[PDB]
Amino acid sequence: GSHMQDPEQLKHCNGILSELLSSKHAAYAWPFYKPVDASALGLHDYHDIIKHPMDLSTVKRKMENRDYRDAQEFAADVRLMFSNCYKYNPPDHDVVAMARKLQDVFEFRYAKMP
Numbered sequence: 001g002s003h004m005q006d007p008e009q010l011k012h013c014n015g016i017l018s019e020l021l022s023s024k025h026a027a028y029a030w031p032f033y034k035p036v037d038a039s040a041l042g043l044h045d046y047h048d049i050i051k052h053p054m055d056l057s058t059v060k061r062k063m064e065n066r067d068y069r070d071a072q073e074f075a076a077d078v079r080l081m082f083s084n085c086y087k088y089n090p091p092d093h094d095v096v097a098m099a100r101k102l103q104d105v106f107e108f109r110y111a112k113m114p
């Protein structure tokens with residue numbers, strides 16, 4: 001059920017999303033900018049292991065099209081994106097180190113929900 005705080009909380013979500021895509025975090029955010037191109041990377045098992053792909057360009061499109069109805073729905077997709085990375089890759093892989101740093105950015109600012 002829609003709350004009157006939902007538009008404002010979604011604005012905070014959109015702010016976080018803008019930050020995740022900004023130059024400030026680009027050194028570790030870039031693997032998450034676009035959908036994993038499994039074939040191009042030779043990751044021919046990716047879509048057998050990851051049943052629900054997610055990436056920041058897909059989150060952005062969903063925010064722009066008002067697909068997300070509340071902050072929780074946005075947050076679940078962002079976390080899905082990170083969880084896919086932790087599921088597919090070995091935990092010492094550099095892409096996982098980048099995921100953890102970007103998720104720290106996400107979680108600490110998401111916790112600042114006004």
Ligand SMILES: Nc1nc2c(ncn2COCCO)c(=O)[nH]1
Pocket residue numbers: 030031032036037041084085088089095
């Ligand atoms: N190994 C691997 N590469 C990824 C993953 N997520 C993002 N990338 C890198 O894609 C960006 C293009 O080089 C992932 O989970 N698997």
